[PDB]
């Protein structure tokens, strides 16, 4: 859903945040107060493992939720789209209003075990 | 025109309290008033829905 994709992901960074830090709520409340909750700033990265099996409207509604975090200026977001193939399939599935959100600084790096042998 | 006529029946029900099916002495107090024999004939059948 939109819900547990948020909630598990906030949980997964939070234990990663306490382990480097040496009660709270698992949503975007931590994201703004991360400057005060943990001192230093935040640069998270999103290893979307198998991206074409997900219902894309959930993914499209997910990225609009991340769009609201762009007004705090102490956090940096980075998305990694590990597709299997077929980039043209992916620009078909999403909402076109979010592709224009995506198309700011895209980089189509190829990673293939078989690349020119 | 029918709210009063239940109470003259209640004046009989004051007297003996009888729920008889066919009438010869209930109708006797009706003809001196001004209503016909047909209006009370409907009043027999419709007050059967009141189970009285």
């Amino acid at each position: 859903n939109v819900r547990m994709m948020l909630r598990r992901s906030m949980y997964k960074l939070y234990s990663a945040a306490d382990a480097e830090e040496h009660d709270v709520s698992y949503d975007l409340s931590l994201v703004e107060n991360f400057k005060r909750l943990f001192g230093k700033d935040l640069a998270m990265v999103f290893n979307f493992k198998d991206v074409d099996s997900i219902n894309f409207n959930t993914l499209d509604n997910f990225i609009i939720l991340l769009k609201s975090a762009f007004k705090y200026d102490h956090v940096k977001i980075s998305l990694i789209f590990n597709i299997n193939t077929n980039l043209s399939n992916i620009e078909k599935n999403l909402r076109q209003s979010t592709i224009r959100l995506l198309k700011r600084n895209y980089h189509k790096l190829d990673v293939s075990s078989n690349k020119g042998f | 025109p029918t709210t009063k006529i239940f109470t003259i029946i209640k004046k009989m029900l004051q007297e003996t309290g009888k729920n008889t099916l066919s009438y010869e002495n209930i109708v006797k107090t009706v003809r001196l008033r001004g209503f016909t024999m047909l209006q009370l004939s409907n009043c027999i059948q419709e007050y059967s829905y009141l189970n009285v």
Partner: protein, 425 residues
């Protein structure tokens, strides 16, 4: 217990005890019984044997609500305090979760509070180990049967132990309850006593009224003419016409045979004469009186008569415009359930099939724009979401949920003939 000391306050500024106030004090539903006289013994002689012999039995009574089965078994145990037991009112509907009754029993043996799991362990440990006395009322048994019958098997398996100091008394809604909800393995444990309670009869319904009207029927009050206060300047009396009390009985015994319904229709009819007496003289709130037959004629009808007919003729125009379109489709198709877009299709069509009558034109001007020839050309009519929402929460209409606002079906909820009939006005 504790806070009833705090529920008392001091300043009580001389409330006017009028004529009909002292009626409603005894017409309160609180304070030997005439109707279920011998069946009180049939419970009690079934109960007196097991009590004075240290056994474990079961007693099953049924009947419609309003017949005294809440009352009678309280009168059983009440005299028994004069002559070894712990009384508990284990109500079914007063338990939030069905397992919560288990907590009460283990609370009401020593005073401990554990879970429903840990209670019934020690309850079972009680019911087969104690050397040798517990009365328990399992009221309103429709509540505690619902989930998987695992609770109900326990409450009768405890009865089977010969070393179980317990006396259970079940009071249900129907005699059918261990035959259409329970299993046969419970139905062996329920026994075959099965004391049936019928309704009340209309003769006894007279005999229950005057028990409340014992010291007050045709008695005398002492009244000052200035405030309307009555004391058990004139010395007035108040009489109750017994024939009107009789016609109260011959209806309530006919339909329901309910002891609350008989008292309350007398209680409702009592206050009709209260306001009419206050209307004629105005004593506020700071020769021979009676209660007519015409009071209980209204108040009994006041249980029956509706207003949805009067509600419909007092609705808006577009409300009555809506239903008249809706019956037109139901006699066009005969399918009693029409698509929402077809109704919007019809109310368009029901404009121009009528002529160029200027009333319809003054309607048709207003029906698509609130005057204001600037803004016009509305597709669906003005406030069409509003009246359809107003007909929905009123309960007259019913509309299934769909995000399409065209093919969502609509179903009537009241009888369509009375909808046809109220439309005629």
């Amino acid at each position: 217990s504790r806070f009833e000391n705090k529920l008392k306050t001091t300043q009580k500024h001389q409330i006017v005890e009028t004529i009909f106030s002292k009626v409603k004090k005894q017409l309160n539903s609180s304070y030997y019984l005439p109707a279920r006289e011998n069946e009180f013994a049939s419970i009690y002689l079934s109960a007196y044997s097991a009590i004075e012999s240290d056994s474990a039995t079961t007693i099953y009574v049924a009947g419609t609500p309003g017949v005294g089965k809440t009352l009678t078994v309280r009168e059983v145990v009440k005299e028994l305090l004069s002559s070894d037991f712990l009384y508990v009112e284990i109500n079914g509907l007063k338990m939030v979760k069905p397992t919560d009754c288990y907590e009460t029993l283990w609370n009401k043996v020593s005073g401990e509070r554990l879970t429903w799991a840990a209670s019934m362990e020690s309850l079972e440990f009680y019911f087969k180990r104690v050397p040798k006395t517990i009365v328990v009322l399992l009221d309103e048994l429709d509540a505690m049967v619902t989930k998987s019958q695992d609770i109900m098997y326990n409450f009768f398996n405890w009865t089977t132990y010969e070393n179980a100091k317990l006396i259970v008394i079940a009071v249900a809604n129907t005699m059918d309850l261990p035959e259409r909800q329970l299993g046969n393995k419970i139905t062996s444990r329920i026994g075959f006593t099965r004391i049936m309670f019928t309704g009340y009869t209309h003769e006894e319904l007279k005999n229950i009224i005057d028990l409340r009207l014992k010291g007050l029927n045709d008695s005398f009050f002492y009244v000052d003419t200035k405030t309307g206060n009555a004391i058990l300047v004139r010395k007035v009396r108040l009489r109750m016409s017994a024939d009107a009390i009789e016609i109260a009985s011959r209806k309530v015994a006919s339909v329901s045979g309910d002891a609350r319904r008989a008292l309350k229709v007398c209680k409702r009819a009592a206050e009709i004469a209260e306001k009419h007496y206050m209307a004629k003289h105005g004593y506020g709130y700071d020769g021979v009186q009676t209660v007519h037959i015409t009071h209980v004629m209204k108040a009994l009808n006041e249980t029956l008569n509706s207003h949805v007919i009067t509600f419909m003729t007092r609705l808006s125009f577009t409300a009555k415009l809506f239903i008249y379109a809706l019956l037109n489709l139901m006699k066009k198709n005969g399918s009693q359930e029409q698509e929402l877009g077809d109704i919007v299709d019809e109310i368009k069509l029901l404009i121009e099939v009528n002529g160029s009558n200027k009333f319809v034109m003054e309607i048709a001007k207003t029906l698509f724009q609130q005057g204001s020839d600037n803004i016009s050309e509305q597709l669906r009519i003005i406030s069409w979401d509003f009246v359809l929402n107003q007909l929905l929460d009123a309960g007259i209409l019913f509309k299934q949920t769909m995000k399409n606002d065209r093919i969502c079906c609509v179903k009537l909820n009241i009888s369509v003939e009375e909808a046809k009939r109220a439309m005629n006005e």
